[PDB]
Write a protein that binds this ligand. Sequence first.
Ligand SMILES: Nc1ncnc2c1ncn2[C@@H]1O[C@H](COP(=O)(O)OP(=O)(O)O)[C@@H](O)[C@H]1O
Ligand SMILES: Nc1ncnc2c1ncn2[C@@H]1O[C@H](COP(=O)(O)OP(=O)(O)O)[C@@H](O)[C@H]1O
Ligand SMILES: Nc1ncnc2c1ncn2[C@@H]1O[C@H](COP(=O)(O)OP(=O)(O)O)[C@@H](O)[C@H]1O
Ligand SMILES: Nc1ncnc2c1ncn2[C@@H]1O[C@H](COP(=O)(O)OP(=O)(O)O)[C@@H](O)[C@H]1O
Ligand SMILES: Nc1ncnc2c1ncn2[C@@H]1O[C@H](COP(=O)(O)OP(=O)(O)O)[C@@H](O)[C@H]1O
Ligand SMILES: [Ca+2]
Ligand SMILES: [Ca+2]
Ligand SMILES: [Ca+2]
Ligand SMILES: [Ca+2]
Ligand SMILES: [Ca+2]
Lengths: 375, 375, 375, 375, 375
Amino acid sequence: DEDETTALVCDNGSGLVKAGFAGDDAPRAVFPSIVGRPRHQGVMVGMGQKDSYVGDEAQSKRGILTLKYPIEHGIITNWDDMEKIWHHTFYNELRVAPEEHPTLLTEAPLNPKANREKMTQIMFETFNVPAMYVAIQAVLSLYASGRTTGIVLDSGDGVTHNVPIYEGYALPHAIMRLDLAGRDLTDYLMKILTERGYSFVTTAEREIVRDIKEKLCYVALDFENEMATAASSSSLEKSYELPDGQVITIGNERFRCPETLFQPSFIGMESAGIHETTYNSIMKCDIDIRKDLYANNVMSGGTTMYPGIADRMQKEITALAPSTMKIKIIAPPERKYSVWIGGSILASLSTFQQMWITKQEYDEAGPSIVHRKCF
Amino acid sequence: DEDETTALVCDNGSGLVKAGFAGDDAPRAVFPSIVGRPRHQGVMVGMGQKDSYVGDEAQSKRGILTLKYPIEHGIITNWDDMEKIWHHTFYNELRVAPEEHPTLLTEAPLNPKANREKMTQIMFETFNVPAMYVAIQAVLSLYASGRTTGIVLDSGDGVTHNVPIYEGYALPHAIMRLDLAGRDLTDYLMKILTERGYSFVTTAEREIVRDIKEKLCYVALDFENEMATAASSSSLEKSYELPDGQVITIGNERFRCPETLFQPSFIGMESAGIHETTYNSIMKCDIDIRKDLYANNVMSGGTTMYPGIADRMQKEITALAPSTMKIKIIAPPERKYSVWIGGSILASLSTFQQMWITKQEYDEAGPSIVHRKCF
Amino acid sequence: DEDETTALVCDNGSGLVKAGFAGDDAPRAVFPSIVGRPRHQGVMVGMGQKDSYVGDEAQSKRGILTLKYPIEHGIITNWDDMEKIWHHTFYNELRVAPEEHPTLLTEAPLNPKANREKMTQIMFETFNVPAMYVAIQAVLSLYASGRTTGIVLDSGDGVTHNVPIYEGYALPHAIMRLDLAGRDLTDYLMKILTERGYSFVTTAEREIVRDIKEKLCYVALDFENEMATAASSSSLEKSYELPDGQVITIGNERFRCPETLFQPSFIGMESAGIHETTYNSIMKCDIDIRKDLYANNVMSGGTTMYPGIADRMQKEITALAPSTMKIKIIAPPERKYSVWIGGSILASLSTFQQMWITKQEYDEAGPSIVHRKCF
Amino acid sequence: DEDETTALVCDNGSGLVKAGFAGDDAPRAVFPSIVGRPRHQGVMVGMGQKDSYVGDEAQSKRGILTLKYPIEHGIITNWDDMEKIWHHTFYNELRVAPEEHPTLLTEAPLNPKANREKMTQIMFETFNVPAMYVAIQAVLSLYASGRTTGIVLDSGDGVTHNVPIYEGYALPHAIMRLDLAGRDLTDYLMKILTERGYSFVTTAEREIVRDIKEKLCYVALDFENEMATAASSSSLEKSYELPDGQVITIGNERFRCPETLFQPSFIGMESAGIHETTYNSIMKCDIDIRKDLYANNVMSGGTTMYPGIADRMQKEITALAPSTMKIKIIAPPERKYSVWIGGSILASLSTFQQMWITKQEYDEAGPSIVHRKCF
Amino acid sequence: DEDETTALVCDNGSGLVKAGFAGDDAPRAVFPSIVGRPRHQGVMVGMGQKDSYVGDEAQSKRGILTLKYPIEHGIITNWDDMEKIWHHTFYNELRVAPEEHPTLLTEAPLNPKANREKMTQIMFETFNVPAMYVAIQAVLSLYASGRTTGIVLDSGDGVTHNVPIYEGYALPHAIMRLDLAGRDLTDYLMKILTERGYSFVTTAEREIVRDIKEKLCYVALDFENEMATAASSSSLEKSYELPDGQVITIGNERFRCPETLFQPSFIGMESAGIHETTYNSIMKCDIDIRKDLYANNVMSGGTTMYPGIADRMQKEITALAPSTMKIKIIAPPERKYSVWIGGSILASLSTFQQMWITKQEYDEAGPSIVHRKCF
Ligand SMILES: Nc1ncnc2c1ncn2[C@@H]1O[C@H](COP(=O)(O)OP(=O)(O)O)[C@@H](O)[C@H]1O
Ligand SMILES: Nc1ncnc2c1ncn2[C@@H]1O[C@H](COP(=O)(O)OP(=O)(O)O)[C@@H](O)[C@H]1O
Ligand SMILES: Nc1ncnc2c1ncn2[C@@H]1O[C@H](COP(=O)(O)OP(=O)(O)O)[C@@H](O)[C@H]1O
Ligand SMILES: Nc1ncnc2c1ncn2[C@@H]1O[C@H](COP(=O)(O)OP(=O)(O)O)[C@@H](O)[C@H]1O
Ligand SMILES: Nc1ncnc2c1ncn2[C@@H]1O[C@H](COP(=O)(O)OP(=O)(O)O)[C@@H](O)[C@H]1O
Ligand SMILES: [Ca+2]
Ligand SMILES: [Ca+2]
Ligand SMILES: [Ca+2]
Ligand SMILES: [Ca+2]
Ligand SMILES: [Ca+2]
């Protein structure tokens, strides 16, 4: 605060920017990292009072907006708009200057080497920031839950990761990366929706595709066995008159799309489901290591909030794995803010001082300060 | 030939099947031991005229194939496909029956005891083969070059070996084995390629990873000293517009991956570089033995064809070793066929008759005929 | 104790540090002389609460440790770590100061002359120790059992020894030394394990190799005769589903490795089995001496705890030896602590005062005090 | 020669077979009576062109050989190999048939009665030899130097002897025999080498032990006085970087092993040094006999070629002996061939005809012909 | 006894100390006059409970002892140890003080004049002894058998003597002395044993040489005639598997060593056999004296207990001697204690009082008391 650093806590992504102060219970400032642009065109006298629709203000009015997606995988299509997105975070909501407090961000595992410097360059060289540290997505969720060892599969929208963690951080061998996250599932629904009679192609309806999914589509216990169950007119058929002006008879469609996550074969790829890669990464490890990896299967993120997600991991895991320990998927009561809570503690402890990167340190070692101190 | 044995010469592996007749200069039949399977899916009217893509026919069209890898380390994932691979060798290209000529194969050092019998079983018990002998990979390369004593480090894709050889064959004491060969380097590139902005994950691009490496990536003389040299924009930066439709700005990446071979630390293991193990195996031997081991350091295989491979062995070897003899890595003009030439002579000499295994000998002593005669 | 000497009893080695107080029945403090180092690498926030893993704390968690072996034969690879190992013995477990009590250690027969002074130097010159004496490994086991004459073959991990003992101590003539102990057997298993299909190469699995051996591998009565017995599917084949997640079908492997102890030919050496050297050392002695050497064949150490060890010495000994006395291998009910019990008595008797080395005696005769008083 | 006898000259032993023609200056054919056997094992295609390595051909390549020692004291471990050793002497090097020339050999003093007949049996009964005579080792060295009276101490490898000689040959009373020769010193070095940190145990390094000794180890003038001199860092400390790849810091070790020859106490025996037995054998003789025994102390053999051997005999002899004559050890310029020169003359003179044993004489008196004519 | 003299009876030598009380049948205390010293060396904790091994205690354990021979001919190598030998006789076994009883010892014929006084000096001047008398070895054996005239050849270990005895004691003229006794035969066996293949050189095997002789080696009736008999494989060849662990094929060796006694020519001397000197001493005497000398040829001592000793004296004596009387060697049933029995009577009779030397008599005439009273 003015006369002292005092850092904030932020978990930026391509879905929700979880920013807030220190010592809170839930994120105060939240909005999707997306900028809207007028598509209606024409002239203006009484406009919507916005030139570049952003966040909640943008997501609210979709009809007139052409949602520009900055962070599309990890690569940013354009950095020019990112500058205004950050100008909206500090000055507007938080109402605090960036030339005052440090900044705690999240690191999308295996992000281009140029981004690490490019991002920090916008803070330190451009808008003089006292300090900043970009922690590694998943690792934070471990301490928040109160664990110190297990296997964390933190996936959101950008990318997918299988990170087995121990008291000592893992190494490039058991960990994996895959480009089959939420955004891939969102753009896939429209594809399979054509066989029934739906076509949410354009932008204003591209978001609706995401909306119908989260609050209805359930995951099947056994796709192959429930496919024939579709004949039974009782458990599936349920007219859901969308409270707006349309009926969406979702029968065999409810568990046809979610299966794609575990069955990319419906897309046209070689990559096996995320439950096959789970075996691949574990089976390689030494014999005297797996026993505790199954004891605590950590599954965090919004991807793990679909009605009926743990039950599926009761047959798939037990199949190709030892049978000595008890199996159960751990999904904390509040798994969504798993990353936000963990970062709050580190930003509160004074011991963290001997880790972060100080302002002057950047200038004293140029842009290479990053890879010069950390890895 | 029909009325007489007359053996062939084959050096099978997981990269190139070097088969041909006797008295030739170069291998006639060559193809990778890999089978492809359709991944595009759908229906067929005018197909690619293949049910199980194999060898050159397979490697040619990667886009539609899901390259099934039979020989993955030494262990074969599946033997059912191996039967067709051998059905393609004799009948198709060579156009000669296996019930006619013997067979000279190579032995992957320290291969499971069951394989020795299992392989021969497919020849003798299944497709009646007059005779066969499976010689030991490296030893053949020694006579081909015209040497009788030295240290041969024959490595390809399957496994790595350090075989010091003398007039009398070595013994389990100085020789070593390691699972850090080409295939480990091929699957590693994609890992470190993510820090820059590349992700050749799926199969159709898994092979491209191998292609870019061999015809560009050079080996550094001093990694630690050339890492800082990266700042110099002249010796590294060279836009290589891949003749297809993409630019691959390889600067510090050219000598970052090759170093992994000698620096597994970048992976996450304990195993030291293959140049450390070289010391380990030699330093144990008697004092009055090393002087000639350095005089002729044999380095064969495709692994020893990277621009700038001998220069590195001029500082590493001389460091922890006596300084009495002259040091120089011997890489014959044609080191790739080092194994093929050596086997050709043995398959030509009539004196070899008192060594190989005859057809009936297998039936007269059951499957144990192998370990019963040889070791 | 503070106002008086009162010595402890220690039997240090490269396997178990048998330390404890006086007047006990079993060793209180026990741990392997090995230090672990993080190999997982990365960063730390909630570490394993250890910088240099040691003893039980180290052996417990192998996955993250790179077991540094200090005492590797007798020669110590590095003395810098040995200082902390001894700092862990007194202060932590025993909770007694070294500037208070003497110290009773064991002497690895035929240890470098420099070590005798180097070791004592760390006690007397560095951490002022009132007194210390380093007794000779085997001799102690003789009195513990309650014997005064026979032939003791005390072997553990460091080195092998054949020490015939009489009321008057032996002399360099019948005694022998050999570098073919446990550590040689431990590192050998991985070698022969490759013919079947196992490769416990790296460190985290190097220890597992030692674990599977001790609690399963039995010793054959007649290797050459039991090799053919392997055909019989009843006495060997027994699926041992390792309680973890893997099956280890040990058939002819159970008695293939143990035979190497008595048959180094499987390695590639000239040294005959330890049962041949037994003849060599005895056959030289006078004619009127052997009769009592066979009457009591002492065999101590963990090496003599494999199911079926005495039976083998019923044919090998009787073969090339007189046939007048009764033959039987003496392995006391508790042969493991044979050295610990013997040293306890000497450390209890007050008559021992006229033997040990006093603190000041070291300073009054410099470092040469050792060879100046004793030999 | 074919149409006539004409004898050769041979001085066979367990170190060098000094064979050659008559009228030469130095031995033409020389090699150690040792046979080598492959220990590397495995298979063969380009072998070392030898089944039973012998002599120079064997000593050259030690690494692959398991040096079989035929003549081990006097007793021959095995006679079957001795047959080939002699087949190598005549036919190969000399290129002359044994059924043509006699044979002059040496007699190891006090050799089993059976050997005299057994050896001759292989020549006369097996490979019809015209004649042969086996003269007594030392006596020959007397005439070669040109002396007719004195005390000869001819020792090599087999056994030690103190033979006082006069115009009339000595008698079993002053002469002595002892089993403390070179071979005992060679196998002793490895014993005392363990206190420093060396262990040349196996065969390939057993010979190296003999090599380091002869060309470095010097003999002390006063061991007890030079033991304290070790403190002086100038006369002893001299880094001898063995031209191969190892440093052997020999300080107090140079004169510690040689002393064992004169001080068997370091081994564990009762036998006094060879300089004590010298007194024992002389002090018994009559009073009017010693005066000339000291005047000419003959010391021949390779044992008397260590830098500083005569000086030691200047204090030890003068101590317990009369002081009337001048004392000086006589070691001819060429003392190594002392036995070869003496035998050459006897094999040249025609007067020798009335001494040797003729072919038919053996058959006319059976195998007992030896003890029937000579003693 | 305390209040009165009462003498003991002792026959000390270098083989057996025959001591005991008066009125007994056999000697109670018996042991060889030899002291042992540790040769094994090293350190001690549980020693053999002896600093100076003596007598039975010493002879029992030879392996660790360096048998010190005090009385070596007659001359004592060292008197310092003799003091303890006598301290062991009275105090330990007999449990009686020397300041209480006289002492009856034996006199080695022709012993140095200084010894007579030196010995008595240790008794009278040092350990106040009431009285003592040193009788002449052989003369005692005469009365024991019950004879009063003949020729006694009493030989043991020290020296040889030919003592013709009559009612009146002999005189220096017919009597003789020779240094060719048992000890000379014991040290000779090892010499001739080398021609066959034995070498019992060191101390621990020096005694074994004496052991094998007494209980096997027989004496030939006619050496020259039995030498050829060796060819006959029936009367000689008899495998005597020494009950310990070795075979000693004694054929012509059984009667080769014993002959040396009568044929010193095999050694290298001029002295004729003890049967030639027998003639020499008798042929000189008057003509009218020999007739009774042959009638009773007394032969006592352990030397006359070899199977077949009298038969030899049936041809040798009758050869060069008158043929009027009957010839027969007299060897009493118990000839070993011939000296002990004779001395017992003299020590029992009260008439002996007027002969022995009283305590005070020594002080009243100084050390010369011996030659002053007796001769
Ligand atoms: N209750 C829910 N059920 C299923 N998906 C949800 C739920 N709430 C949010 N999501 C989804 O989670 C994703 C955002 O998760 P988040 O962890 O913020 O991603 P990122 O950090 O990669 O931007 C969006 O795809 C959103 O639709
Ligand atoms: N010119 C080259 N430079 C570098 N690597 C090469 C070259 N040519 C071939 N290779 C590589 O060598 C390997 C095949 O070598 P090979 O000896 O046939 O192996 P294997 O016998 O183990 O199947 C492949 O990894 C291939 O990419
Ligand atoms: N029950 C057992 N059976 C076989 N080996 C055993 C047993 N218990 C311990 N060992 C082995 O004994 C060795 C340790 O013995 P120890 O006498 O302490 O050796 P050192 O003193 O040389 O360190 C280790 O190799 C260990 O695996
Ligand atoms: N220059 C030398 N100095 C010391 N020892 C030597 C020398 N040359 C040879 N020897 C030794 O002499 C011995 C051979 O001597 P030799 O008289 O031939 O013996 P033998 O006749 O008993 O076989 C070997 O031990 C050898 O190492
Ligand atoms: N039964 C026996 N046969 C042959 N020699 C024997 C026998 N018993 C003892 N001796 C020998 O007799 C000698 C001892 O005789 P002894 O009369 O006591 O001698 P001394 O009095 O000279 O000491 C020893 O050499 C011993 O080996
Ligand atoms: Ca996420
Ligand atoms: Ca290869
Ligand atoms: Ca031990
Ligand atoms: Ca010699
Ligand atoms: Ca006697």
